[PDB]
Amino acid sequence: GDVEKGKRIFIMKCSQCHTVEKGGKHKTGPNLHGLFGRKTGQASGFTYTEANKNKGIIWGEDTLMEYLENPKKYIPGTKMIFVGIKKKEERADLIAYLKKATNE
Numbered sequence: 001g002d003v004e005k006g007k008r009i010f011i012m013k014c015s016q017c018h019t020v021e022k023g024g025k026h027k028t029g030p031n032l033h034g035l036f037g038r039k040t041g042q043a044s045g046f047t048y049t050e051a052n053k054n055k056g057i058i059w060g061e062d063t064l065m066e067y068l069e070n071p072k073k074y075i076p077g078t079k080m081i082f083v084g085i086k087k088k089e090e091r092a093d094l095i096a097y098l099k100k101a102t103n104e
């Protein structure tokens with residue numbers, strides 16, 4: 001995906017509730033640093049729903065592609081009230097940005 005396009009998508013659609021940098025603050029949603037390769041519900045210091053803790057998947061490109069299309073379909077009962085991104089290329093670009101930004 002296109003990291004530069006994905007950053008803009010993140011800012012427009014996600015930054016209201018999320019940070020990505022190491023040591024970044026929790027907002028309505030958790031800081032996302034270290035997301036890839038981690039089970040759901042594991043950001044340090046954030047209180048998740050039981051639903052997000054129970055999901056028991058590992059975040060990576062494929063599981064994010066699915067989640068971000070329709071969050072409540074993937075994790076029923078989640079407190080992330082976000083409609084989703086319908087277009088696959090936009091999800092891919094966002095996820096490429098996340099893969100970079102949450103790993104530095």
Ligand code: HEC
Binds near residue numbers: 015017041048051
């Ligand atoms: C507020 C209105 C949000 C917006 C907009 C987005 N997210 Fe979110 N997210 C939010 C909350 C409250 C939570 C916790 C959910 C719970 O049920 O406890 C989350 C969670 C995520 C997760 C899962 C994190 C984990 O399991 O550690 C991810 C991967 C995530 N959010 C990503 C994300 C992205 C990329 C967004 C823009 C497209 C986005 N969220 C919007 C709140 C909100």
Ligand SMILES: [Cl-]
Binds near residue numbers: 048049050051
């Ligand atoms: Cl709960």
Ligand SMILES: [Cl-]
Binds near residue numbers: 061062
């Ligand atoms: Cl991956």
